[PDB]
Design a protein around this ligand. Structure first.
Ligand SMILES: [Cl-]
Ligand SMILES: [Cl-]
Ligand SMILES: [Cl-]
Length: 95
């Protein structure tokens, strides 16, 4: 996508892992090649520190979707509430 704050899981792409027809199907700053593969570097470091470059799929959390015991189980800049839910805005780019 557009840059390191764009988060996308390429494993599940149509046609197979890391395959694409558009830049939105590639993580971070990666873009779609002429042969239909994502190319480039998503971000440095990867994973990013907590903040807008941190990519995490909360749907898979062990306590249930969007449930947490620590803020590293929350996407982007989100943090763990006292009640054990991820909260705030992740801060990721839309594309
Ligand atoms: Cl970005
Ligand atoms: Cl497929
Ligand atoms: Cl961090």
């Amino acid at each position: 996508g557009s840059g390191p704050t764009y988060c996308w899981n390429e494993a599940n792409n149509p046609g197979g892992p890391n395959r694409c027809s558009n830049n939105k199907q590639c993580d971070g700053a990666r873009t779609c090649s002429s042969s239909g593969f994502c190319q480039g570097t998503s971000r440095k470091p990867d994973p990013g520190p907590k903040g807008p470059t941190y990519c995490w799929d909360e749907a898979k959390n062990p306590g249930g979707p969007n449930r947490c015991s620590n803020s590293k189980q929350c996407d982007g800049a989100r943090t763990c509430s006292s009640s054990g839910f991820c909260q705030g805005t992740a801060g990721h780019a839309a594309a």
